[PDB]
Design a protein around this ligand. Structure first.
Ligand SMILES: [Cl-]
Lengths: 243, 240, 231, 244, 250, 222, 111, 235, 241
């Protein structure tokens, strides 16, 4: 054997064990989700409060690309930042040449090809993050999830991290109960509930909730963070449902 | 470009590639340098498993770096050519910029620096060569003899030997060389050099080379008969 | 075991052992403490010597008039990273006439450390850093780890026996955060914090190192007889 | 990374030997024997082709003996493909010297440079050495007729008579026995063939398994001629000495 | 990133073998049989078209390839390796010869250039040797007709006739009995078809056999008229129908 | 080395007690041909800065894209992008000044004369000039091209030194700017009647006025 | 053809006493026959009790002052907050200027 | 094998730790700092009696105000000295002044970690850098291949270092004269050296504000050796 | 045994990394099929969407390389998209350089050459994909050309790829034995699609809904994919016969 010691080596199965090992690092990370809605997308993430000494609201994990795309990820946080930095470069050169802001499917493949490139050589390590991202473009709303292998698909709802199965189950119920569609303001509230429900798989340390959203009507097609009254309202909704 | 760090430290603090290069020097034919009151003599062993040789055209063991400095060596022959070439080029470059030929110390310091560079550069192995560099500084009559080795260290010697069985000939020189009174003449210096090689060589026929360097670019190589006379004289005094 | 030969290799459980071994170098380092109020931010560092004949290794480095850090681990790596911060702070001033935000400083350090954990040939940085600063949004304290992870805090500590000071600050949180407009008292709290990490040794005059930055105070370092006030 | 798969071709053994050079010489020892003999009025180059097939085109073939310029030739022992790389480099080097100085290149200078190239592959670059040993046969107005040999280590030496490839130990003993200094070319031709005939691994030495060449001053007055022997000419010289 | 493999992947073993070259020759042994026969007025090269699937169109896969108007090539071993070698061989005939001398290279020299390329894959950093043996047939004014074999090592040999691949040992013995120095081109084609039938197992017709010749100039295949000195290519690929005509009088 | 093709003429500006005013006409000239009439040469950055540009229009559009990109880049990983860490006029200017001087030093300039007008976070008025040579300067009144020769004299009668700034209201200041634009239409052969005007006040913020016209002109003495 | 230089006018003056030194300069800035600013300072405090002015082409003048101010900053970082003496500053400024020998800073500098 | 820039599980760089073992095999070098000057002394250690000991150059000038002693793979020190000299002279060219001893040491130590897969391995030599400047006065630094440097009142490096350092711990005080320091280096060298100490197998040097860096003659050191033996017999 | 980790020869003359890349081809557990009509070339592939949270419209293994060329992939999606982007770039460059649309077979050869390089050069791994290119070429007419990780390529009368490829292959073989021709003798592409689905149903032994399939069609001057309703319309036609 020894097939798992080097990146880009096929095992006799036809598998790249190094990528599968990077997935284990993602599974170890905190929970993050994405919900597609009527005219946009909503992102949410679990922030473990390791200590009283952490300044609340001041270790922001959700990241914006361009002015219309949001990105969140679980796993190795630095690896995620590297991917977003590339995403920002990709989006900038697209807008430079073609004038229009980068479409979400176009942006999704830019990240996909870049992550896939890190499975082609033994001189690089695969990414230790699964990234949930999306936004609003000329063709409407799009939600995507990208994995260490470079694999990505479009999603109605997406989840990754330690509480992914709990969050996936809760997401599937929303898809079944709302065939016509979910509103942006509703999706924010649901996002809070699902993070709180997914926190049961990480319940030693208590946590801090963080939400963001893009909506054609509510945010005018731009990425914004949910703060203040709208955040507390979403927290209270989640608190009422666990009890 | 090929980048691999071939020369590296081991747990005990040794650089094995440099030390194994010293083993290549130990395998090489013996070379000896002895400096007198007014001269330096470089003696060299030539192995006799090679008959049917052409000695006219076969590369000589002692090489002129400039008209006033010479270089002999022990170890890998192919490696030595690279050091000799670089030294010869630096000799002409020094004359061009300083308007004065190199000192023996300077030429030695350069060659030693080249050897050192190959011990901490990527993609290269050390030189499997130790050198004896001898000559006279410009407008100076004090004899100079220096030694270098694969690691890059260099130093001055009253008399020194390198190569196979060099520990035997070094033993000989240590009791037969007086610091207070070095070989006063050319004859005395050549004889002590030939004597020291006869402890190790075999026959004094076409196995020993001798080169004498005197002040002001006066370098000459001895022929077979000239060397054979020293061999004949030493053996007759020995039977006593 | 078989997966710790280089940084480019994941373990079967998804760990990067070279990054973890770099993290271990920080734990061996001498203790240093960081804490802040709303007006000032303070670094306190225990310096370490080779023996009684030697000097005490300097732990604190200035990056700009409004920013600087303390180090624990490989000191040369702290010199490389602090130099990078000096350049980034400086680029911000020359090009934009703008003092670099302490948060951006953290983001830049994170991304620089990350690149060394995903490529063949290189190695992770072997040092942890506590960055303090005062910018347009007040006082700040950051904790840098060579894994790439940067974290903003009210107070913290890194190095050997840093858990003692970290627990103390966790208890004292409500007190020291409201030490506004009083430098000497905020330092006293930091000196008392680092004292919870001492064993057999106590704070002497050429052992202690303090730094402070704030509203009307440039980043300045105190050593020697200037810290005798706080023992 | 890629460190895992590096053979480290340019390192020393604990005994101070170069692994890859030693193993390249082991390869060369299985190649067809090539002999060079230097006489007072010329040089002979003789070489044995590697086990021939009857359907091999013999006349339009070149395996062992190559021309470097009008005054210098080489006999090859080892990988032919490796040798042709080095031969083309040597051919170019000779033309560079002629272009620079308006004089044909001295034999040793060409030999040294080709040997220096081989040396480089043993000290740096991490590549395998050339699995080739040459016998150089040439003439210039400084030293006259000269024989040299070079091997993968990049070390070269001069000879009166020498063999490379297979059975060199046995071949060298036979040459050392019958060679003398006042020898002529026609005598050297006979010695070369007689030596191959006794050291060969084949049943009997025939014209189709040999390449032959001479470098004489047997042109008209004070000039050198290279003669690469044709098949029929080897057949005749083999009868003339009574081997067949 | 970047190619960190700057070192040789083919090295000498203690016994003196070059492992990767030997293993490349083993891959050639597994390959389908191909052969070449030289006549007085031409050369023939032939091979079996091993179809991967009956749904596959074996016409689209050409094992016998034109390199120059007077030079052709066939192989045994790994097909993809052969395909890129033909691309490189065609280009080098232009860049290192035709663009300099205004004429096509003689067979021996083009062979020499291909051999160089295959030698470099044996010594350069981070590459394996080519897993093919080539048979190159061609004609040029001053050397006439010629046939060459090129091996993974980069070595090449001129042949009167030979075979490579699966059943080369038996095929070579067959050719030794039949070959003489007075063979006319048609006689050489006949012997090529006889020799190939021994190694082929399944169907034996013009659709499963690929065969080309180097012979007389073909003015009809030139594509233009008006220049007397230009008389057309000597390389011609025999059609499926032309092969079957000769299989009746077999 | 360049030559300007499509060009914009004067940009004029001044400080008043609570902020700054800046104006420029809507013309894109092609030599003597008055080719394009819908050209906006005042470009706002945030709600606290307006950059007025004269000279080559292709280079102006390039600078637009840079400023647009600067806003995007400043928002990245910046929770206070619309508060304490928002782009200041001084930041925007220094960036442009750096670019202009770098381009002149590479002998490939952006063929422009630029005035950055705005209000800082502490309420202070910001008004500074930079051009193709990388030359920078500040004054209570600033103007480019013909504006320098004809507008500045008129605007300096209102605010002649620093102490005149608190004594100057927004009504008085705008009146002087609008008058100056009329004078430029009389006398500059590459001016248009249509123009844009922007006020950046420390209390009322950014007011951007489009499609203004020069009016109350005297010709009857002809 | 593009001309990378301009003339911003103005004049400067430095006098040294026994225990003091002055560096004066007018505040007018011009191009051709127009005034750009009536108050645009070109004499600067560069730290370590060194005052500097680079008069001529203002863009080059500002660039030089900016680079020297930065040189003082890094001198502190690299040499343990040591004070930059006026003689050392002068030598440093020579290297700044001569570094652009073949595309000069168009200024007369006084410190 | 394994990477050159690899960390051990204990958080140390293998190659740096291994180079420290090479330095322990090196010949002894001692330095003592006083208010009257800094003294540098080394063990020459000739491998054979035929070797001319005065050609052994283990104490070296960097500038007039900075000197240097070495221990370990001494060939590796040549490029370090070359860099130090260039750095010292270059700073004088750029700033018309002497460069601080600490700044020089930092410049040399920047080379240390510039190895990996830059040079192929760390340096196998430790340096004692001694000098004087107007700001911090007389200084002694110990520069390692780790890129770290400590200031010392006194320091020993090489094979006899741990024994010599313990001796320097007892003997050093803040009021030592230059003469007292000279004798102290000779005393401690004689204790840890294999062969018997004399003027040919040991070398002294110092740096003072007034006269700068000076390597002592064999005649001058011989008298200090004689002065040392007499004083130890006198009680 | 490091000869199994990189693309160098094993003692028996094999490249294990290439062989293991072939096994990655079936990792998706999807079967594809391609046939030719008179005027068209049809390609069909299974569409499996297991997760309910997925957006089914974004799940695809068929790609529009150029206006005339389409490509279906058998293998993991990251490698599939890698191949697609390169093919698109190559086809675009060809048109720009040579003034006419890149033929299907020429693109197949080019992508096969790239794949060959990965089998010879060490630092690049093979892509674990099999690429089936389809078009109606302006010279050669309806065309199917297929590429694999070994760098092999060939034209096809028809073809199939996937875990149950052999069953589909023989099914098609037996039809062309019967029909005695090289293609589907049919006028409209609609009925050629119907043939493709019918013979896949017979070979695999499964029924298909509208969301279980994915269809690509190549005609003269355009290649296009079918919607769920286009396929449903096609499924209804088969059922009513
Ligand atoms: Cl290609």
């Amino acid at each position: 054997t020894g097939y798992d010691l080097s990146n880009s080596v096929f095992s006799p199965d036809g598998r790249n064990f190094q990528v599968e090992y990077a997935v284990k690092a993602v599974e170890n990370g905190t929970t993050s989700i994405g919900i597609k809605c009527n005219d946009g997308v909503v992102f949410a993430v679990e922030k473990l409060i390791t200590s009283k000494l952490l300044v609340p609201q001041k270790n922001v994990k959700i990241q914006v690309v361009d002015r219309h795309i949001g990105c969140v990820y679980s796993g190795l946080i630095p690896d995620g930042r590297h991917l977003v930095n590339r995403g920002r470069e990709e989006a900038a050169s697209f807008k430079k040449l073609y004038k229009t802001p980068i479409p979400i499917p176009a942006f999704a493949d830019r990240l996909g090809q870049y992550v896939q490139a890190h499975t082609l050589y033994n001189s690089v390590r695969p990414f230790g993050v699964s990234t949930i991202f999306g936004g609003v473009d000329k063709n409407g709303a799009h939600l995507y999830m990208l994995e260490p292998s470079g694999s990505y698909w479009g999603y109605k709802g997406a989840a990754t991290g330690k509480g992914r199965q709990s969050a996936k189950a809760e997401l599937e119920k929303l898809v079944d109960h709302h065939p016509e569609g979910l509103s942006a303001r509703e999706a924010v509230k649901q996002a809070a509930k699902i993070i709180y429900l997914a926190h049961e798989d990480n319940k030693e340390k208590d946590f801090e909730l963080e939400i963001s959203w893009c909506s054609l009507s509510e945010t005018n097609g731009l990425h914004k963070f949910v703060k203040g009254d709208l955040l507390q309202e979403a927290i209270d909704f989640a608190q009422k449902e666990i009890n | 470009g090929y980048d691999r760090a071939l020369s590296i430290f081991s747990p005990d603090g040794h650089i094995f590639q440099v030390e194994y290069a010293l083993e290549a020097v130990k395998r090489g034919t013996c070379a000896v340098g002895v400096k007198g009151k007014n001269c330096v003599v470089l003696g060299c062993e030539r192995r006799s498993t090679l008959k049917l040789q052409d000695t006219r055209i076969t590369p000589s063991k002692v090489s002129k770096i400039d008209s006033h400095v010479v270089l002999s060596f022990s170890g890998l022959n192919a490696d030595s050519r690279i050091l000799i070439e670089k030294a010869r080029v630096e000799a002409q470059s020094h004359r061009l910029t300083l308007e004065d030929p190199v000192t023996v110390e300077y030429l030695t310091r350069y060659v030693a620096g080249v050897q050192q560079r190959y011990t901490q550069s990527g993609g290269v192995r050390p030189f499997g060569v130790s050198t004896l560099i001898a000559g006279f500084d410009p407008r100076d009559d004090e004899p100079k003899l220096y030694q270098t080795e694969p690691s890059g260290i260099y130093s001055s010697w009253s008399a020194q030997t390198i190569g196979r069985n060099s520990k035997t000939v070094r033993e000989f020189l240590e009791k037969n060389y007086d610091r207070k009174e070095p070989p006063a003449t050319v004859e005395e210096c050549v004889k002590l050099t030939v004597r020291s090689l006869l402890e190790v060589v075999q026959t004094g026929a076409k196995n020993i080379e001798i080169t004498v360097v005197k002040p002001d670019s006066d370098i000459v190589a001895l022929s077979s008969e000239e060397i054979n006379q020293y061999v004949t004289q030493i053996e007759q005094e020995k039977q006593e | 075991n078989n997966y710790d030969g280089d940084t480019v290799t994941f373990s079967p459980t998804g760990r990067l052992f070279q990054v973890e071994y770099a993290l271990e170098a920080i734990k061996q380092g001498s203790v240093t403490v960081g804490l802040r109020s709303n007006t000032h931010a303070v670094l306190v560092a225990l310096k370490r010597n080779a023996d009684e004949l030697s000097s005490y290794q300097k732990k604190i480095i200035k990056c700009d008039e409004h920013m600087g850090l303390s180090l624990a681990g490989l000191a040369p790596d702290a010199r490389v990273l602090s130099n990078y911060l000096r350049q980034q702070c400086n680029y911000s001033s020359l090009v934009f006439n703008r003092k670099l935000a302490v948060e951006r400083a953290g983001h830049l350090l994170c991304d620089k450390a990350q690149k060394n954990t995903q490529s063949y040939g290189g190695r992770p940085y072997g040092v942890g850093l506590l960055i303090i600063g005062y910018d347009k949004s007040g006082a700040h304290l950051l904790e840098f780890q060579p894994s790439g992870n940067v974290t903003e805090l009210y107070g913290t500590a890194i190095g050997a026996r840093s858990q003692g000071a970290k627990t103390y600050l966790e208890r004292t949180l409500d007190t020291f955060i409201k030490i506004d407009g009083n430098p000497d008292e905020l330092i006293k709290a930091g000196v008392e914090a680092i004292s919870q990490s001492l064993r057999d040794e106590s704070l002497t005059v050429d052992n202690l190192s303090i730094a402070i930055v704030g509203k009307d105070t440039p980043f300045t370092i105190y050593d020697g007889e200037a810290v005798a006030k706080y023992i | 990374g890629s460190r895992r798969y590096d053979s480290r071709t340019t390192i020393f053994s604990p005994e101070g030997r170069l692994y890859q050079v030693e193993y390249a010489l082991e390869s060369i020892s299985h190649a067809g024997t090539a002999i060079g003999i230097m006489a007072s009025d010329g040089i002979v180059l003789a070489a044995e082709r590697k086990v021939t097939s009857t359907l091999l085109e013999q006349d339009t073939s070149t395996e062992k003996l190559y021309k470097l310029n009008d005054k210098i030739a080489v006999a090859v022992a080892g990988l032919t493909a490796d040798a042709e790389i080095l031969i083309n480099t040597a051919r170019i080097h000779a033309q560079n010297y002629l272009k620079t100085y308006n004089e044909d290149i001295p034999v040793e200078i060409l030999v040294r440079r080709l040997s220096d190239i081989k040396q480089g592959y043993t000290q740096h670059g991490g590549l395998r050495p050339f699995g080739v040993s040459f016998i150089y046969a040439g003439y210039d107005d400084r030293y006259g007729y000269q024989l040299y040999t070079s091997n993968p280590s990049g070390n070269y030496t001069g000879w009166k008579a020498i063999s490379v490839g297979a059975n060199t130990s046995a071949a060298q003993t036979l040459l050392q026995m019958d060679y003398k200094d006042d020898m002529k070319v026609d005598d050297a031709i006979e010695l070369a063939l007689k030596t191959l005939s006794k050291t060969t691994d084949s049943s009997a030495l025939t014209y189709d398994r040999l390449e032959f060449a001479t470098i004489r001053k047997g042109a008209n007055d004070g000039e050198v001629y290279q003669k690469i022997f044709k098949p029929q000419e080897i057949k005749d010289i083999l009868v003339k000495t009574g081997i067949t | 990133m970047t190619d960190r493999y700057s070192f040789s992947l083919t090295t000498f073993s203690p016994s003196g073998k070059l492992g990767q070259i030997d293993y490349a020759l083993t891959a050639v042994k597994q390959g389908v049989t191909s052969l070449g026969i030289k006549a007085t007025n031409g050369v023939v090269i032939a091979t079996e078209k091993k179809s991967s699937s009956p749904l596959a169109m074996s016409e689209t896969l050409s094992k016998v390839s034109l390199l120059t108007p007077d030079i052709g090539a066939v192989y045994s071993g790994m097909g993809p390796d052969y395909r890129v070698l033909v691309d490189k061989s065609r280009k080098v005939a232009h860049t290192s010869y035709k663009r300099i001398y205004g004429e096509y290279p003689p067979t021996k020299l083009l062979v020499s250039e291909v051999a160089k390329i295959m030698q470099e894959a044996t010594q350069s950093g981070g590459v394996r040797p080519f897993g093919v043996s080539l048979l190159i047939a061609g004609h040029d004014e001053f050397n006439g007709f010629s046939l060459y074999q090129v091996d993974p090592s980069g070595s090449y040999f001129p042949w009167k006739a030979t075979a490579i691949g699966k059943g080369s040992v038996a095929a070579k013995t067959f050719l030794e009995k039949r070959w003489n120095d007075e063979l006319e081109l048609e006689d050489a084609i006949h012997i090529a078809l006889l020799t190939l039938k021994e190694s082929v197992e399944g169907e034996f017709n013009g659709d499963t056999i690929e065969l080309a010749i180097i012979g007389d100039e073909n003015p009809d295949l030139l594509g233009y008229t008006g220049i007397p000195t230009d008389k057309g290519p000597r390389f011609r690929k025999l059609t499926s129908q032309e092969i079957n005509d000769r299989l009746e009088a077999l | 080395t360049q030559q300007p093709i499509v060009t914009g003429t004067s940009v004029i500006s001044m400080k008043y007690d609570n902020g700054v005013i800046i104006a420029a006409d809507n013309l894109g000239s092609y030599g003597s041909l008055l080719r394009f009439n819908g050209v906006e040469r005042l470009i706002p950055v945030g709600d606290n800065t307006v950059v007025g540009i004269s000279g080559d229009i292709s280079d102006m559009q390039h600078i637009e894209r840079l400023l647009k990109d600067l806003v995007t880049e400043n928002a990245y990983d910046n929770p206070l992008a619309d508060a304490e860490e928002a782009l200041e006029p001084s930041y925007i200017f220094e960036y442009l000044a750096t670019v202009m001087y770098q381009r002149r030093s590479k002998m490939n300039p952006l063929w422009n004369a630029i005035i950055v007008a705005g209000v800082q976070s502490n309420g202070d008025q910001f008004l500074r000039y930079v051009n193709l040579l990388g030359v920078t300067y500040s004054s209570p009144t600033l103007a480019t091209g013909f504006g320098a020769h004809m507008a500045n004299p008129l605007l300096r009668k209102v605010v002649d030194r620093e102490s005149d700034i608190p004594k100057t209201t927004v009504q008085v200041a705008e009146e002087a700017i609008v008058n100056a634009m009329r004078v430029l239409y009389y006398r500059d052969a590459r001016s248009s009647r249509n123009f844009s005007l922007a006020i950046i006040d420390k209390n009322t913020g950014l007011t951007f006025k489009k499609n203004l016209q020069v009016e109350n002109m005297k010709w009857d003495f002809a | 053809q593009f001309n990378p230089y301009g003339d911003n006018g103005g004049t400067i003056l430095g006098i040294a006493g026994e225990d003091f030194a002055v560096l004066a300069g007018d505040t007018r800035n011009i191009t051709d026959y127009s005034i750009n600013s009536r108050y645009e300072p070109k004499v600067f405090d560069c730290g370590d009790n060194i005052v500097m002015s680079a008069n001529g082409f203002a863009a080059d003048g500002d660039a030089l002052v900016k680079r020297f101010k930065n040189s003082v900053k890094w001198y502190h970082f690299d040499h343990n907050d040591k004070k930059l003496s006026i003689n050392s500053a002068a030598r440093n400024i020579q290297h700044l200027l001569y570094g652009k020998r073949f595309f000069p800073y168009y200024v007369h500098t006084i410190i | 094998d394994r990477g050159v820039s690899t960390f051990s599980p204990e958080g140390r760089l293998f190659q740096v730790e291994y180079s420290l073992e090479a330095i322990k095999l090196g010949s002894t070098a001692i330095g003592i700092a006083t208010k009257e000057g800094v003294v540098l002394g080394v063990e020459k250690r000739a491998t054979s009696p035929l070797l001319e000991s005065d050609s052994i150059e283990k104490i070296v000038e960097i500038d007039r105000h900075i000197g240097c002693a070495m221990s370990g793979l001494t060939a590796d020190a040549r490029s370090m000295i070359e860099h130090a000299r260039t750095a010292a002279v270059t700073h004088n060219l750029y700033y018309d002044e002497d460069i601080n001893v600490e700044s020089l040491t930092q410049s040399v130590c920047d080379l240390a970690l510039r190895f990996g897969e830059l040079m192929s391995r760390p340096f196998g030599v430790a340096l004692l850098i001694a000098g004087h400047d107007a700001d911090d006065g007389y200084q002694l630094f110990h520069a390692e291949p780790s890129g770290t440097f400590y200031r010392y009142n006194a320091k020993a490096i090489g094979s006899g270092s741990e024994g010599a350092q313990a001796e320097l711990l007892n003997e050093w005080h803040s009021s030592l004269t230059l003469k007292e320091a000279e004798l102290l280096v000779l005393k401690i060298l004689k204790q840890v050296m294999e062969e018997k100490l004399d003027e040919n197998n040991a070398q002294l040097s110092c740096i003072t504000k007034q006269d700068g860096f000076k390597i002592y003659d064999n005649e001058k050191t011989a008298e200090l050796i004689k002065e040392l033996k007499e004083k130890e017999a006198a009680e | 045994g490091y000869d199994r980790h990189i693309t160098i020869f094993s003692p028996e003359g094999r490249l294990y990394q290439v062989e293991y890349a072939f096994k990655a081809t079936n990792q998706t557990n999807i079967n594809s099929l391609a046939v030719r009509g008179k005027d068209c070339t049809v390609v069909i592939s299974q569409k499996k969407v297991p997760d309910k949270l997925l957006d089914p419209t974004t799940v695809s293994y068929i790609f529009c390389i150029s206006r005339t060329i389409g490509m279906v992939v058998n293998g993991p999606i990251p490698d599939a998209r890698n191949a697609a982007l390169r093919a698109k770039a190559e086809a675009a460059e060809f048109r720009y350089k040579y003034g006419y649309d890149m033929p299907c077979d020429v693109l197949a050869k080019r992508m096969a050459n790239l794949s060959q390089i990965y089998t010879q050069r060490a630092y690049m791994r093979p892509l674990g994909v099999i690429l089936t290119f389809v078009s109606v070429d302006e010279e050669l007419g309806p065309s199917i050309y297929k590429t694999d990780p070994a760098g092999y390529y060939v034209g096809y009368k028809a073809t199939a790829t996937g875990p149950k490829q052999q069953e589909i292959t023989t099914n098609l073989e037996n039809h062309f034995k019967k029909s005695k021709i090289d293609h589907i003798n049919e006028e409209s592409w609609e009925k050629v699609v119907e043939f493709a689905i019918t013979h896949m149903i017979d070979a695999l032994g499964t029924e298909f809904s509208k969301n279980d399939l994915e269809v690509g069609v190549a005609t003269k001057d355009k290649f296009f994919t079918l919607s769920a309703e286009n396929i449903e319309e096609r499924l209804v036609a088969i059922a009513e016969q």
